[PDB]
């Protein structure tokens, strides 16, 4: 009933930049500083920030806190970005919060210097929503960087920089340590000296207690097994044979980071909640395995030569003896060839498909390239037909658009209208 209004909200958002906290601070001020209405946990880093945020939210939700959680970007629906107790905001509430902000945005939008960006608006929407919902705590994933990220208006219980990965490392590290706040502890999963040196200097300056993986806490992999990845944690507390459903050994480290983040915060937490929250954590399209109707799907949004190489590493751990099929769609704005090359020698069957997006061009040369690397190649242009066509455990990758689209269909049996926007 507010579905069309919801789509129209997304049109306004997606019609939308000088860096700074000035526009976001002013938007929030005009909304009553909703961000100051609850405790906050703030999570940045190049990789793992979404997983660590999710793990943190999930644990606190299990502990029975009323939790708002804020992510970016999204995979299948915009509503992944804003959650209450890890349930996506409804279309109706997105519309409601938007209608609340509308006159304020209309006013700010009159002048380019005051007009908030997409991310600024969405972030303020989350902050406002968390306030309207009377949350106890909000877990906030940094959009990008940290220092001048829209989320960085908070004063959290803990600031986490999961990693700093390649600007020099030192520059990137600096941008990220802008979420370090006075006296607020910092937790990091980072091990590069260059990166830690910066964070050390900022935290020491801010009188922030800093905790560093392998220094102030650690994890020990007991065993990796699909949906049942078992590890010990050593921080303030010690836990043995914790289980992650999420697959991949980096996720076990993200789990250590999440638990340290939670220790550093002081919040009361049960071991039950930690175990259940870790079991419940999910990072969508990030080496996500979904059994559907007996068949396995490895949903991974890898779209970089780097990301693809990681995928293959992860595949070798969990699917060693397994025959595999690949459904791949890559946009032409990506390094198609250097991506495809990662996947040689792995798949029993390769199906190139079209990324479902008006952005998809040059299917023709994509296919030709693939044919440069594998005897296999089939072209099944509709990616849902492509996945329907496999028997083997199937890796769907190449494009986040592709993965979010297929995931949606697999999990819902339909494709929401946001894909038409
Ligand atoms: Cl197959
Ligand atoms: Cl979408």
Tab-separated table of C-alpha atoms and ligand atoms in Angstrom:
chain	number	residue	atom	x	y	z
A	1	UNK	CA	0.000	0.000	0.000
A	2	UNK	CA	3.098	2.233	0.533
A	3	UNK	CA	5.092	0.129	-1.910
A	4	UNK	CA	4.938	2.712	-4.712
A	5	UNK	CA	5.782	5.455	-2.258
A	6	UNK	CA	8.742	3.364	-1.120
A	7	UNK	CA	10.011	2.994	-4.727
A	8	UNK	CA	9.572	6.774	-5.148
A	9	UNK	CA	11.671	7.311	-2.016
A	10	UNK	CA	14.391	5.184	-3.658
A	11	UNK	CA	14.133	7.225	-6.835
A	12	UNK	CA	14.759	10.395	-4.742
A	13	UNK	CA	17.712	8.745	-3.012
A	14	UNK	CA	19.226	7.364	-6.209
A	15	UNK	CA	18.869	10.696	-8.067
A	16	UNK	CA	21.686	11.989	-5.704
A	17	UNK	CA	30.369	15.237	-3.257
A	18	UNK	CA	32.837	17.377	-1.213
A	19	UNK	CA	34.058	15.433	1.767
A	20	UNK	CA	33.229	16.497	5.354
A	21	UNK	CA	30.965	15.963	8.378
A	22	UNK	CA	29.305	19.386	7.932
A	23	UNK	CA	26.264	18.342	5.913
A	24	UNK	CA	25.539	15.225	8.025
A	25	UNK	CA	25.961	17.154	11.281
A	26	UNK	CA	23.489	19.803	10.061
A	27	UNK	CA	20.932	17.255	8.802
A	28	UNK	CA	21.025	15.411	12.102
A	29	UNK	CA	20.838	18.658	14.069
A	30	UNK	CA	17.676	19.651	12.226
A	31	UNK	CA	16.276	16.158	13.039
A	32	UNK	CA	16.983	16.605	16.777
A	33	UNK	CA	20.316	14.790	16.870
A	34	UNK	CA	18.700	11.338	16.883
A	35	UNK	CA	22.184	9.793	16.806
A	36	UNK	CA	22.767	10.949	20.408
A	37	UNK	CA	19.735	9.129	21.693
A	38	UNK	CA	21.348	5.700	22.293
A	39	UNK	CA	24.693	3.961	22.821
A	40	UNK	CA	26.630	3.203	19.711
A	41	UNK	CA	29.318	0.830	18.391
A	42	UNK	CA	31.317	1.925	15.426
A	43	UNK	CA	32.949	-0.459	12.947
A	44	UNK	CA	35.306	0.352	10.098
A	45	UNK	CA	38.058	-1.301	8.164
A	46	UNK	CA	38.779	-2.234	4.581
A	47	UNK	CA	37.484	-5.800	4.917
A	48	UNK	CA	35.394	-7.476	7.571
A	49	UNK	CA	33.512	-4.453	8.812
A	50	UNK	CA	30.144	-5.747	7.611
A	51	UNK	CA	30.803	-9.225	9.131
A	52	UNK	CA	32.099	-7.784	12.402
A	53	UNK	CA	29.117	-5.402	12.641
A	54	UNK	CA	26.707	-8.240	11.908
A	55	UNK	CA	28.343	-10.482	14.489
A	56	UNK	CA	28.241	-7.713	17.081
A	57	UNK	CA	24.561	-6.962	16.365
A	58	UNK	CA	23.616	-10.583	16.352
A	59	UNK	CA	25.223	-11.235	19.710
A	60	UNK	CA	23.551	-8.225	21.334
A	61	UNK	CA	20.212	-9.110	19.774
A	62	UNK	CA	20.566	-12.620	21.313
A	63	UNK	CA	21.413	-10.998	24.655
A	64	UNK	CA	18.073	-9.288	24.378
A	65	UNK	CA	19.191	-5.727	23.668
A	66	UNK	CA	17.055	-3.670	21.335
A	67	UNK	CA	19.579	-3.167	18.552
A	68	UNK	CA	19.655	-0.901	15.509
A	69	UNK	CA	22.232	-1.916	12.939
A	70	UNK	CA	23.437	0.059	9.946
A	71	UNK	CA	25.085	-1.415	6.847
A	72	UNK	CA	26.254	-0.394	3.383
A	73	UNK	CA	25.934	-1.053	0.642
A	74	UNK	CA	23.204	-3.641	0.007
A	75	UNK	CA	23.056	-6.778	-2.036
A	76	UNK	CA	19.391	-7.458	-2.895
A	77	UNK	CA	17.291	-4.828	-1.177
A	78	UNK	CA	17.953	-1.370	0.104
A	79	UNK	CA	16.308	-2.439	3.348
A	80	UNK	CA	19.378	-4.570	4.338
A	81	UNK	CA	21.007	-1.242	5.255
A	82	UNK	CA	18.788	-0.538	8.290
A	83	UNK	CA	17.702	-3.135	10.801
A	84	UNK	CA	15.943	-3.483	14.106
A	85	UNK	CA	16.971	-6.591	15.941
A	86	UNK	CA	18.431	-7.719	12.644
A	87	UNK	CA	15.145	-7.525	10.782
A	88	UNK	CA	15.194	-5.235	7.706
A	89	UNK	CA	13.307	-1.988	7.972
A	90	UNK	CA	9.964	-2.312	6.249
A	91	UNK	CA	9.101	-0.427	3.089
A	92	UNK	CA	6.422	1.349	5.161
A	93	UNK	CA	8.919	2.603	7.723
A	94	UNK	CA	11.389	3.727	5.114
A	95	UNK	CA	8.518	5.771	3.664
A	96	UNK	CA	7.643	7.064	7.168
A	97	UNK	CA	11.142	8.155	8.066
A	98	UNK	CA	11.506	9.724	4.662
A	99	UNK	CA	8.271	11.730	5.100
A	100	UNK	CA	9.554	12.967	8.466
A	101	UNK	CA	12.838	14.183	6.866
A	102	UNK	CA	11.292	15.446	3.607
A	103	UNK	CA	10.711	19.105	4.599
A	104	UNK	CA	14.200	19.232	6.110
A	105	UNK	CA	15.729	17.695	3.032
A	106	UNK	CA	13.690	19.981	0.792
A	107	UNK	CA	15.186	22.930	2.615
A	108	UNK	CA	18.819	21.674	2.619
A	109	UNK	CA	18.410	20.558	-0.997
A	110	UNK	CA	17.964	24.106	-2.150
A	111	UNK	CA	21.697	24.798	-1.906
A	112	UNK	CA	24.360	22.522	-3.168
A	113	UNK	CA	26.711	23.284	-0.226
A	114	UNK	CA	24.065	22.091	2.257
A	115	UNK	CA	22.494	19.312	0.229
A	116	UNK	CA	23.168	15.900	1.835
A	117	UNK	CA	24.587	13.074	-0.327
A	118	UNK	CA	22.877	9.721	-0.790
A	119	UNK	CA	24.846	8.166	2.035
A	120	UNK	CA	24.324	11.135	4.278
A	121	UNK	CA	20.576	10.897	3.819
A	122	UNK	CA	20.438	7.120	4.345
A	123	UNK	CA	22.639	7.357	7.417
A	124	UNK	CA	20.449	10.041	8.919
A	125	UNK	CA	17.450	7.877	8.087
A	126	UNK	CA	18.994	5.032	10.057
A	127	UNK	CA	19.828	7.313	12.985
A	128	UNK	CA	16.319	8.714	13.034
A	129	UNK	CA	14.774	5.259	12.731
A	130	UNK	CA	16.853	3.964	15.633
A	131	UNK	CA	15.628	6.918	17.650
A	132	UNK	CA	11.954	6.483	16.648
A	133	UNK	CA	12.389	2.804	17.631
A	134	UNK	CA	13.940	3.546	21.061
A	135	UNK	CA	16.905	1.218	20.516
A	136	UNK	CA	19.317	0.501	23.388
A	137	UNK	CA	22.262	0.396	21.055
A	138	UNK	CA	23.125	1.015	17.440
A	139	UNK	CA	25.897	-0.864	15.581
A	140	UNK	CA	27.226	1.185	12.718
A	141	UNK	CA	29.228	0.019	9.813
A	142	UNK	CA	31.392	2.756	8.284
A	143	UNK	CA	30.359	3.564	4.708
A	144	UNK	CA	33.853	4.395	3.523
A	145	UNK	CA	37.100	5.576	5.162
A	146	UNK	CA	36.042	6.720	8.596
A	147	UNK	CA	37.326	10.198	9.365
A	148	UNK	CA	34.641	11.963	7.230
A	149	UNK	CA	32.173	9.147	6.944
A	150	UNK	CA	28.586	10.067	7.660
A	151	UNK	CA	28.501	7.566	10.529
A	152	UNK	CA	31.427	9.296	12.271
A	153	UNK	CA	29.156	11.780	14.041
A	154	UNK	CA	28.815	9.222	16.850
A	155	UNK	CA	30.632	8.842	20.152
A	156	UNK	CA	30.584	5.061	20.564
A	157	UNK	CA	31.287	2.615	23.346
A	158	UNK	CA	34.018	1.180	21.117
A	159	UNK	CA	35.555	1.950	17.722
A	160	UNK	CA	36.744	-0.991	15.662
A	161	UNK	CA	39.046	-0.937	12.683
A	162	UNK	CA	38.884	-4.492	11.469
A	163	UNK	CA	41.631	-4.115	8.835
A	164	UNK	CA	43.563	-1.603	6.817
A	165	UNK	CA	44.282	-2.961	3.303
A	166	UNK	CA	45.614	-1.275	0.110
A	167	UNK	CA	47.062	5.850	-1.312
A	168	UNK	CA	49.740	4.428	0.981
A	169	UNK	CA	48.723	2.161	3.839
A	170	UNK	CA	49.616	4.991	6.149
A	171	UNK	CA	47.150	7.360	4.414
A	172	UNK	CA	44.377	4.789	4.376
A	173	UNK	CA	45.195	3.930	8.000
A	174	UNK	CA	44.904	7.595	8.856
A	175	UNK	CA	41.470	8.078	7.247
A	176	UNK	CA	40.255	5.012	9.140
A	177	UNK	CA	41.622	6.110	12.496
A	178	UNK	CA	39.332	9.205	12.290
A	179	UNK	CA	36.708	7.013	14.049
A	180	UNK	CA	38.989	6.829	17.115
A	181	UNK	CA	37.327	8.968	19.795
A	182	UNK	CA	38.538	10.442	23.072
A	183	UNK	CA	38.841	7.795	25.769
A	184	UNK	CA	36.840	5.390	23.620
A	185	UNK	CA	38.653	2.115	23.185
A	186	UNK	CA	39.842	0.921	19.784
A	187	UNK	CA	39.831	-2.686	18.588
A	188	UNK	CA	41.746	-3.855	15.506
A	189	UNK	CA	42.302	-7.029	13.486
A	190	UNK	CA	45.188	-5.331	11.704
A	191	UNK	CA	48.721	-6.665	11.729
A	192	UNK	CA	50.628	-4.341	9.298
A	193	UNK	CA	53.133	-2.316	11.262
A	194	UNK	CA	52.553	0.800	9.125
A	195	UNK	CA	48.870	0.687	9.808
A	196	UNK	CA	49.157	-0.045	13.554
A	197	UNK	CA	51.708	2.762	14.017
A	198	UNK	CA	49.109	5.293	12.865
A	199	UNK	CA	46.327	3.845	15.021
A	200	UNK	CA	48.706	3.656	17.982
A	201	UNK	CA	49.583	7.313	17.572
A	202	UNK	CA	45.919	8.385	17.308
A	203	UNK	CA	44.691	6.223	20.227
A	204	UNK	CA	47.605	7.260	22.431
A	205	UNK	CA	46.702	10.890	21.604
A	206	UNK	CA	42.972	10.274	22.237
A	207	UNK	CA	43.780	8.347	25.472
A	208	UNK	CA	41.979	5.369	23.904
A	209	UNK	CA	42.821	1.899	25.031
A	210	UNK	CA	43.792	-0.107	21.940
A	211	UNK	CA	43.391	-3.843	21.469
A	212	UNK	CA	45.142	-5.616	18.701
A	213	UNK	CA	44.710	-9.131	17.373
A	214	UNK	CA	47.417	-11.588	18.560
A	215	UNK	CA	48.443	-8.937	21.087
A	216	UNK	CA	45.336	-8.338	23.211
A	217	UNK	CA	43.264	-11.176	21.870
A	218	UNK	CA	43.448	-14.125	19.558
A	219	UNK	CA	41.492	-16.973	17.913
A	220	UNK	CA	42.527	-20.569	17.299
A	221	UNK	CA	40.843	-22.442	14.468
A	222	UNK	CA	39.790	-25.854	15.816
A	223	UNK	CA	38.202	-26.918	12.501
A	224	UNK	CA	36.688	-25.544	9.339
A	225	UNK	CA	33.615	-27.395	8.166
A	226	UNK	CA	30.802	-25.999	6.084
A	227	UNK	CA	28.331	-24.164	8.409
A	228	UNK	CA	30.163	-25.476	11.453
A	229	UNK	CA	33.478	-23.679	11.803
A	230	UNK	CA	34.898	-24.250	15.185
A	231	UNK	CA	37.382	-22.074	17.133
A	232	UNK	CA	38.649	-20.952	20.573
A	233	UNK	CA	38.777	-17.261	21.582
A	234	UNK	CA	41.167	-15.631	24.135
A	235	UNK	CA	40.422	-12.067	25.263
A	236	UNK	CA	39.215	-10.858	28.669
A	237	UNK	CA	37.162	-14.011	28.430
A	238	UNK	CA	38.120	-17.334	26.997
A	239	UNK	CA	35.775	-19.529	25.006
A	240	UNK	CA	36.464	-22.935	23.488
A	241	UNK	CA	34.756	-24.524	20.448
A	242	UNK	CA	32.769	-21.533	19.340
A	243	UNK	CA	30.972	-22.133	16.076
A	244	UNK	CA	30.524	-19.890	13.089
A	245	UNK	CA	28.021	-20.688	10.469
A	246	UNK	CA	29.741	-18.265	8.114
A	247	UNK	CA	32.442	-20.025	6.136
A	248	UNK	CA	35.942	-18.852	5.525
A	249	UNK	CA	38.877	-18.614	7.993
A	250	UNK	CA	38.954	-14.752	7.821
A	251	UNK	CA	35.522	-14.922	9.405
A	252	UNK	CA	36.958	-16.631	12.457
A	253	UNK	CA	39.215	-13.631	12.848
A	254	UNK	CA	36.306	-11.275	12.337
A	255	UNK	CA	34.604	-13.205	15.151
A	256	UNK	CA	37.598	-12.552	17.486
A	257	UNK	CA	37.426	-8.885	16.538
A	258	UNK	CA	33.667	-8.831	17.271
A	259	UNK	CA	34.145	-10.440	20.709
A	260	UNK	CA	36.958	-8.039	21.598
A	261	UNK	CA	34.814	-5.191	20.379
A	262	UNK	CA	32.116	-6.424	22.772
A	263	UNK	CA	34.522	-6.983	25.687
A	264	UNK	CA	36.006	-3.460	25.249
A	265	UNK	CA	32.562	-1.943	25.398
A	266	UNK	CA	31.801	-3.170	28.958
A	267	UNK	CA	28.277	-4.326	28.080
A	268	UNK	CA	26.945	-7.284	29.976
A	269	UNK	CA	26.839	-10.369	27.753
A	270	UNK	CA	26.152	-14.037	28.248
A	271	UNK	CA	28.172	-16.771	26.683
A	272	UNK	CA	24.842	-18.099	25.387
A	273	UNK	CA	24.279	-14.896	23.386
A	274	UNK	CA	27.839	-14.914	22.075
A	275	UNK	CA	27.484	-18.484	20.871
A	276	UNK	CA	24.040	-17.984	19.386
A	277	UNK	CA	24.868	-14.603	17.841
A	278	UNK	CA	27.979	-16.107	16.170
A	279	UNK	CA	25.926	-19.056	14.929
A	280	UNK	CA	23.355	-16.538	13.540
A	281	UNK	CA	25.734	-14.087	11.872
A	282	UNK	CA	25.517	-13.921	8.096
A	283	UNK	CA	27.422	-11.811	5.579
A	284	UNK	CA	25.368	-11.800	2.442
A	285	UNK	CA	27.092	-12.786	-0.789
A	286	UNK	CA	30.390	-13.017	0.979
A	287	UNK	CA	31.343	-16.674	0.450
A	288	UNK	CA	27.865	-17.492	1.327
A	289	UNK	CA	26.828	-21.066	0.813
A	290	UNK	CA	23.107	-21.712	0.500
A	291	UNK	CA	21.706	-25.229	0.224
A	292	UNK	CA	18.525	-24.919	-1.791
A	293	UNK	CA	16.570	-28.014	-2.717
A	294	UNK	CA	19.577	-30.267	-2.077
A	295	UNK	CA	21.904	-28.230	-4.287
A	296	UNK	CA	24.683	-26.007	-2.962
A	297	UNK	CA	25.281	-22.520	-4.169
A	298	UNK	CA	28.431	-20.583	-3.408
A	299	UNK	CA	27.322	-16.972	-3.654
A	300	UNK	CA	30.275	-14.686	-3.799
A	301	UNK	CA	30.236	-11.187	-5.127
A	302	UNK	CA	33.965	-11.269	-6.079
A	303	UNK	CA	34.415	-8.826	-9.004
A	304	UNK	CA	38.178	-8.098	-8.665
A	305	UNK	CA	41.045	-10.242	-9.631
A	306	UNK	CA	41.915	-10.031	-5.924
A	307	UNK	CA	38.412	-11.034	-4.756
A	308	UNK	CA	38.272	-13.878	-7.257
A	309	UNK	CA	41.633	-15.227	-6.059
A	310	UNK	CA	40.220	-15.205	-2.487
A	311	UNK	CA	37.154	-17.022	-3.646
A	312	UNK	CA	39.264	-19.784	-5.129
A	313	UNK	CA	41.270	-20.103	-1.932
A	314	UNK	CA	38.054	-20.452	-0.005
A	315	UNK	CA	36.767	-23.016	-2.552
A	316	UNK	CA	39.875	-25.147	-2.087
A	317	UNK	CA	39.224	-25.369	1.652
A	318	UNK	CA	35.621	-26.338	1.673
A	319	UNK	CA	35.131	-28.117	-1.687
A	320	UNK	CA	38.383	-29.908	-2.230
A	321	UNK	CA	37.024	-33.219	-3.661
A	322	UNK	CA	33.929	-31.567	-5.125
A	323	UNK	CA	32.962	-31.176	-8.777
A	324	UNK	CA	31.947	-27.588	-9.356
A	325	UNK	CA	30.101	-25.479	-11.866
A	326	UNK	CA	30.591	-21.732	-12.361
A	327	UNK	CA	27.950	-19.245	-13.271
A	328	UNK	CA	29.804	-16.007	-14.067
A	329	UNK	CA	28.655	-12.529	-15.182
A	330	UNK	CA	30.985	-9.586	-15.104
A	331	UNK	CA	30.408	-6.004	-16.130
A	332	UNK	CA	32.764	-4.493	-18.669
A	333	UNK	CA	33.942	-1.856	-16.164
A	334	UNK	CA	35.793	-4.610	-14.366
A	335	UNK	CA	38.975	-6.488	-15.201
A	336	UNK	CA	37.173	-9.355	-16.878
A	337	UNK	CA	40.235	-11.162	-18.107
A	338	UNK	CA	42.254	-11.001	-14.916
A	339	UNK	CA	39.122	-12.216	-13.043
A	340	UNK	CA	38.397	-15.165	-15.400
A	341	UNK	CA	41.978	-16.303	-15.195
A	342	UNK	CA	41.663	-16.973	-11.465
A	343	UNK	CA	39.086	-19.640	-12.222
A	344	UNK	CA	41.050	-21.824	-14.584
A	345	UNK	CA	41.534	-25.456	-13.585
A	346	UNK	CA	38.723	-25.487	-10.983
A	347	UNK	CA	35.355	-25.980	-12.608
A	348	UNK	CA	33.910	-28.923	-14.349
A	349	UNK	CA	31.535	-26.578	-16.142
A	350	UNK	CA	31.533	-22.894	-16.959
A	351	UNK	CA	28.463	-20.896	-17.796
A	352	UNK	CA	28.769	-17.215	-18.663
A	353	UNK	CA	25.566	-15.295	-18.041
A	354	UNK	CA	24.368	-11.703	-18.325
A	355	UNK	CA	24.541	-9.443	-15.273
A	356	UNK	CA	20.936	-8.353	-14.680
A	357	UNK	CA	21.444	-4.614	-14.890
A	358	UNK	CA	21.102	-2.013	-17.610
A	359	UNK	CA	24.780	-1.400	-16.842
A	360	UNK	CA	25.667	-4.764	-18.483
A	361	UNK	CA	27.435	-4.254	-21.863
A	362	UNK	CA	29.661	-6.442	-24.093
A	363	UNK	CA	28.364	-9.858	-23.319
A	364	UNK	CA	30.018	-10.673	-26.609
A	365	UNK	CA	33.640	-10.031	-25.601
A	366	UNK	CA	33.041	-11.464	-22.119
A	367	UNK	CA	32.139	-14.790	-23.665
A	368	UNK	CA	35.081	-14.620	-26.090
A	369	UNK	CA	37.453	-13.983	-23.220
A	370	UNK	CA	36.030	-16.890	-21.246
A	371	UNK	CA	36.562	-19.012	-24.323
A	372	UNK	CA	40.228	-17.866	-24.253
A	373	UNK	CA	40.499	-19.732	-20.818
A	374	UNK	CA	38.168	-22.846	-20.836
A	375	UNK	CA	37.029	-25.553	-23.327
A	376	UNK	CA	33.763	-25.666	-21.470
A	377	UNK	CA	32.112	-22.345	-22.078
A	378	UNK	CA	28.298	-22.240	-22.269
A	379	UNK	CA	26.289	-19.094	-22.491
A	380	UNK	CA	23.055	-19.029	-20.568
A	381	UNK	CA	22.021	-15.448	-20.662
A	382	UNK	CA	19.305	-15.518	-18.001
A	383	UNK	CA	21.234	-16.152	-14.789
A	384	UNK	CA	18.257	-17.931	-13.157
A	385	UNK	CA	18.141	-20.371	-16.054
A	386	UNK	CA	21.885	-20.709	-15.647
A	387	UNK	CA	21.550	-21.744	-11.994
A	388	UNK	CA	18.501	-23.862	-12.731
A	389	UNK	CA	20.662	-25.779	-15.220
A	390	UNK	CA	23.337	-27.030	-12.842
A	391	UNK	CA	23.472	-30.258	-10.857
A	392	UNK	CA	26.850	-29.634	-9.231
A	393	UNK	CA	27.639	-27.350	-6.402
A	394	UNK	CA	27.472	-23.979	-8.250
A	395	UNK	CA	29.592	-20.880	-7.739
A	396	UNK	CA	27.714	-17.711	-8.705
A	397	UNK	CA	30.134	-14.825	-9.019
A	398	UNK	CA	31.546	-11.965	-11.131
A	399	UNK	CA	29.217	-9.202	-10.016
A	400	UNK	CA	27.435	-8.091	-6.834
A	401	UNK	CA	24.354	-7.247	-8.950
A	402	UNK	CA	24.428	-10.812	-10.249
A	403	UNK	CA	24.867	-12.328	-6.799
A	404	UNK	CA	22.194	-10.196	-5.124
A	405	UNK	CA	19.761	-10.989	-7.909
A	406	UNK	CA	20.264	-14.727	-7.791
A	407	UNK	CA	20.283	-14.793	-4.000
A	408	UNK	CA	17.018	-13.009	-3.990
A	409	UNK	CA	15.429	-15.525	-6.271
A	410	UNK	CA	16.869	-18.467	-4.476
A	411	UNK	CA	15.704	-17.254	-1.104
A	412	UNK	CA	12.395	-15.684	-2.137
A	413	UNK	CA	11.363	-17.199	-5.432
A	414	UNK	CA	10.909	-13.688	-6.751
A	415	UNK	CA	12.681	-10.531	-7.784
A	416	UNK	CA	11.684	-7.339	-6.090
A	417	UNK	CA	10.887	-4.212	-8.099
A	418	UNK	CA	14.015	-2.386	-6.822
A	419	UNK	CA	15.790	-4.308	-9.570
A	420	UNK	CA	13.648	-2.326	-12.070
A	421	UNK	CA	14.677	1.089	-10.519
B	1	LIG	CL1	26.301	-28.812	-13.446
B	2	LIG	CL1	19.108	-3.678	-6.052
